[PDB]
């Protein structure tokens, strides 16, 4: 999987409450988190499926 999949989730400075997915490498799972609406990092997906397809397997 890409190394960016190993980065912690990043809400950013904006103040929306948008539910996005990130790959949690420690748990080995795609998980939900709150995205604020701007300055997304790469470990930030609109669906669990997008997250699994991108960060799923090594």
């Amino acid at each position: 999987r890409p190394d960016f999949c190993l980065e912690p989730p990043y809400t950013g400075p904006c103040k929306a409450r948008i539910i996005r997915y990130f790959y949690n490498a420690k748990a080995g799972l795609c998980q939900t988190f709150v995205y604020g609406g701007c300055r997304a990092k790469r470990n930030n997906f609109k669906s669990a499926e997008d997250c699994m397809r991108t960060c799923g397997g090594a």
Binding site: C14, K15, A16, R17, G36, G37
Partner: peptide
């Protein structure tokens, strides 16, 4: 302050 979910 305003916080996440207050945007807009």
């Amino acid at each position: 302050d305003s916080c996440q979910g207050d945007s807009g």
